[PDB]
Design a protein around this ligand. Structure first.
Ligand SMILES: O=C(O)Cc1coc2cc(Cc3ccccc3)ccc12
Length: 188
């Protein structure tokens, strides 16, 4: 077959019932995830190959960066609760990996302040139980598949993208293969 288990994707030997249609996991510490955001735009290109209105979810993970990694999962919960993902994703990636000016939870807060989120709103969300629950939701989603690597994408809680098996000589061909594999898995 043109698409094969073990090549463009793998299949969860323990499937996950009732998961998001398209579920991505990333870390602001993950060097491949930086590229998925800034130069490959994987999420937008997958979204454009899927039918209108499909649900796409993106969660942060704890396993990179120790203390700061868990701070970043809580900050991502804040971004989701406030609906400001598009405003903070790039400055958080660059603060962690490019300028390395993010060394503490206070530095993370500064990114939101600079992006126009009021301090009172940030702190209220940061300490909220809604955000506590969103942190739990991100951990539970990753736990379901004992995620040990990012960036990861799961389709219908059944299939996991395998970018290791895709052409990397050309960045746009890679994105195309990745998105076409998601489309194939979604129609499956
Ligand atoms: O860990 C792995 O090998 C899999 C993998 C996950 O994300 C990636 C991003 C790139 C970046 C790139 C893409 C296309 C052309 C040049 C450079 C390369 C490989 C991967």
């Amino acid at each position: 077959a043109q698409y094969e288990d073990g090549k463009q994707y793998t299949t969860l030997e323990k499937p996950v019932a009732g998961a998001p249609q398209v579920l991505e996991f990333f870390s602001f510490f993950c060097p491949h995830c930086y590229q998925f955001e800034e130069v490959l735009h994987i999420s937008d290109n997958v979204k454009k190959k899927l039918p209108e209105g499909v649900k796409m979810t993106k969660y942060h993970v704890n396993f990179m960066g120790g203390d700061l990694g868990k701070d970043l999962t809580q900050a991502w919960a804040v971004a989701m609760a406030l609906g400001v993902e598009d405003k903070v994703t790039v400055p958080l990636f660059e603060g962690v990996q490019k300028t390395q000016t993010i060394r503490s939870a206070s530095d993370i807060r500064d990114v939101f302040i600079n992006a126009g989120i009021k301090g009172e709103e940030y702190d209220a969300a940061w300490n909220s139980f809604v955000v506590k629950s969103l942190v739990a939701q991100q951990e539970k989603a990753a736990a379901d598949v004992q995620l040990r690597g990012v960036p990861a994408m799961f389709v219908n809680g059944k299939y996991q993208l395998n970018p290791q098996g895709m052409d990397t000589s050309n960045m746009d061909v890679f994105v195309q293969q990745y998105a076409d594999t998601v489309k194939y898995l979604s129609e499956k």
